[PDB]
Design a protein around this ligand. Structure first.
Ligand SMILES: CNc1nc(Nc2ccc(N3CCOCC3)cc2)c(C(N)=O)nc1-c1cncc2c1ncn2C
Length: 287
């Protein structure tokens, strides 16, 4: 499961695709089959024992869903853990909308449906993603939608910096999560709020309040009079899209709908939602 060897023995490392608190991602080609894969390098911390690392790799191999990037295998080499995963050729939705411009209501509807399918699966496994945003939703050349990973819960490498990263960029987090280090916890419903913000992000090219200093956003969010965000242009988006934003951005998590409940919302249960919508979006990259 975790080969004690250099992944360069089996893979030809191509260009760097990007990275962050979750590691460094490289495009790579298998030397035998010729197939393209993604290789993520996670630097191991001084307290990352291999017994806990083994439990995590077991979770990475069993936590599987069509709307989550497939895990192929891993390598432990020179204090760096390398995870091999399916290659999503078009990159993230942020990589796409920062070329194409705003997604159509139908395109956002399909992405939100596919993400909710992945979130409903993660929540059935008692996992909370806690990292839903356009940059963490990848698209393959077939227009399929996949979450890059199952979220922040992987206890590998820079887990703490990844867990706390929202403090410097809290725009996608639910108010009960933005109430960091206060007595109230949170639950899986915070992912539903993050998906509502992601839908405004795909419509507007940035989440609400993106230009406000992160510490000011945290302050505003933990106020009793905080009004959840809304789409900026009412006379472009349908009543169904406005309502989907209204219910996903419910301030109280005790009133916010589950991922399974959201899958029957009129916006994401409408006919004609399929990968063809994203194939049309990818065609705009040529122009
Ligand atoms: C940099 N991140 C990732 N890039 C990938 N591929 C990819 C492919 C193409 C581009 N381009 C092409 C040229 O135009 C710009 C866009 C960018 C990226 C992948 C993958 N599987 O293909 N995966 C991750 C990734 C993996 N784990 C966790 C992650 C990840 N992203 C966020 N989180 C939290």
């Amino acid at each position: 499961d975790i080969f004690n060897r250099d992944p360069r023995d089996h893979y030809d490392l191509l260009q760097r695709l990007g990275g962050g608190t979750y590691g460094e991602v490289f495009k790579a080609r298998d030397k035998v089959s010729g197939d393209l894969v993604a290789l993520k390098m996670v630097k191991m911390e001084p307290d990352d024992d291999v017994s806990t690392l083994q439990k995590e790799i077991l979770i990475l191999k069993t936590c599987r869903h069509a709307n989550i990037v497939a895990y192929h295998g891993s390598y432990l080499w020179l204090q760096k853990l390398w995870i091999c995963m399916e290659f999503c050729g078009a990159g993230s939705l942020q990589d796409i909308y920062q070329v194409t411009g705003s997604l159509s209501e139908l395109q956002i509807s399909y992405v939100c449906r596919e993400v909710l399918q992945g979130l409903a699966y993660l929540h059935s496994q008692k996992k909370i993603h806690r990292d839903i945003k356009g940059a963490n939703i990848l698209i393959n050349d077939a227009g399929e939608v996949r979450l890059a990973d199952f979220g922040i819960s992987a206890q590998i490498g820079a887990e703490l910096a990844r867990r706390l990263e929202f403090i410097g960029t809290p725009y996608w987090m639910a108010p009960e999560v933005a109430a960091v280090a206060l007595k109230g916890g949170y639950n899986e419903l915070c992912d539903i709020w993050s998906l509502g913000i992601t839908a405004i992000e795909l419509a507007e090219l940035q989440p609400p309040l993106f230009d406000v200093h992160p510490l000011r956003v945290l302050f505003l969010m933990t106020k009793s009079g905080y009004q959840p965000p809304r789409l900026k242009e009412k006379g472009k988006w349908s009543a169904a899209f406005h309502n989907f934003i209204k219910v996903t951005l419910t301030k109280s998590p005790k009133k916010r709908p589950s991922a399974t409940k959201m899958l029957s919302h009129q916006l994401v249960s409408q006919p004609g939602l399929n990968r063809g919508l994203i194939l049309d979006l990818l065609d705009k990259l040529k122009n």
